[PDB]
């Protein structure tokens with residue numbers, strides 16, 4: 001009965017996620033830990049041409065009033081599909097190999113992913129909605145498509161003060177502070193949402209506490225108010241019927257959001273430290289993560305093959 | 317636990333699927349109708365019209381293939397939302413196969429694969445969707461649960477054109493090139509399920525598409541559409557990311573149970589044939605004691621809100 005440890009490193013761009021993941025992997029034996037990198041080659045060439053350049057280019061032309069919100073939404077929506085494809089297809093092929101949740105002995109294999117499918121199907125789309133370039137209905141359609149949450153889904157989010165974050169970003173994409181704020185807010189909201197659900201929060205019971213505007217710990221702390229969760233973003237006029245509550249189609253999508261996030265294992269990594277400091281901190285966090293059994297005898301080698309294949313073909 | 321019979325009425329538009337499903341249920345049989353209100357108002361404004369106008373603009377050379385594909389892509393997300401959200405919430409209620417009449421019969425107007433696979437594939441055949449986008453939607457197809465019975469149609473082309481002309485939805489343009497494409501995709505779909513059920517291995521047969529248990533040839537299945545040059549490396553090999561999506565397609569389609577309804581007849585004749593087809597469909601148990609009444613509620617609420 002070989003066990004597997006899956007860890008998805010996620011959160012806003014520019015905090016040091018990629019470095020620290022590589023550093024952690026460099027500490028292990030090549031055969032017992034494998035890095036699933038960002039699929040940059042899929043994004044710039046294989047799925048479409050220079051998808052990142054197109055997203056940045058679209059938000060800029062919308063911001064400058066050169067294209068309409070509608071024109072922006074179509075490009076952003078199609079672009080996000082391209083951005084999420086390698087994550088969704090990897091999740092789908094991995095799925096059959098994942099058994100139940102297995103502290104416990106060291107895992108036979110550890111897979112560290114640079115992001116989870118919810119980055120492209122939920123977080124970046126929600127931030128683009130805040131930026132005016134995605135409709136809330138399209139964000140909810142993406143949510144309804146998030147794959148069932150496999151057992152042992154450990155997600156590591158990141159903490160980094162805005163000023164240090166902004167500092168790192170003056171490195172070269174395009175320098176969008178509003179987008180940085182939006183993606184930090186969405187990942188904030190996501191950590192609070194997982195805690196709200198894990199504390200027994202029912203969005204349907206608390207929906208009425210939202211009426212207002214905009215004024216995190218994913219696995220500690222008291223229960224957050226629904227106003228500090230992702231459910232706050234969907235009180236948009238577009239989604240409300242003439243009686244005032246959400247149309248049922250959108251309510252069901254929120255039911256799906258709850259189901260998917262409630263069973264996840266979320267951890268917060270302080271990135272306000274040197275690269276080796278982030279590496280250790282993540283390594284200490286990796287000890288409280290949930291492992292799973294695998295379903296077949298050869299699932300370990302198959303999974304390892306999948307991960308190396310992915311890295312070779314799609315990472316730079 | 318009580319048993320459930322799920323029946324997805326699908327296939328090319330213009331065949332009379334909605335006419336014949338109306339008649340079928342015209343409290344132990346509930347209909348999840350075509351979510352026309354989502355398409356025209358709730359999800360976006362007149363998405364049908366936007367899809368047919370875009371293809372028309374592309375056919376006339378007013379917009380580029382790239383401009384069309386972005387619109388078709390974004391619009392297929394809108395079209396499929398009602399199906400995807402319905403499947404996501406119904407999923408936890410479906411238990412294993414049960415194999416006497418079911419406690420509930422849920423008849424749907426289409427399955428999620430219409431919007432995540434068949435319409436995208438037809439638009440690729442129409443030059444208005446990239447094959448990479450079709451495989452992105454394929455990777456997102458929900459896992460096939462037990463008892464997924466899908467009814468596809470059979471109808472001669474000329475008769476289908478006649479019926480298509482009467483069944484025009486709001487914003488639709490009569491397009492015989494799209495009719496041919498959607499008829500080709502659904503025919504390929506039926507052959508693909510048979511291919512996979514008789515043990516066909518797309519990876520083993522792939523060379524037959526380029527290097528020259530009775531089952532259809534692979535060139536007569538959906539896999540042939542994915543020999544698209546955009547998905548291949550300079551040496552001709554398919555990129556693994558796309559091969560994986562084809563592995564997902566094989567997994568999702570193989571376990572669906574396909575039934576063919578002859579539409580070349582009257583609405584009562586079509587309705588009657590549909591009912592004859594139900595004896596071979598697979599029923600499942602539900603997972604909770606309360607699964608039945610809540611599924612019924614889902615179905616009525618969907619209908620009331622999104623049905624025309």
Ligand SMILES: Cc1cn([C@H]2C[C@H](O)[C@]3(CO)C[C@H]23)c(=O)[nH]c1=O
Nearest residue numbers: 013052055083084115119120124173
């Ligand atoms: C995952 C994801 C990323 N991105 C961009 C922002 C980020 O800085 C990046 C590297 O992660 C360049 C690519 C999106 O726009 N959408 C997405 O779904």
Ligand SMILES: Cc1cn([C@H]2C[C@H](O)[C@]3(CO)C[C@H]23)c(=O)[nH]c1=O
Nearest residue numbers: 329330364367395426430431435485
């Ligand atoms: C399911 C589906 C339908 N359609 C159109 C064709 C059809 O005739 C219709 C009603 O069934 C108008 C809507 C698409 O364009 N994409 C789709 O995924």
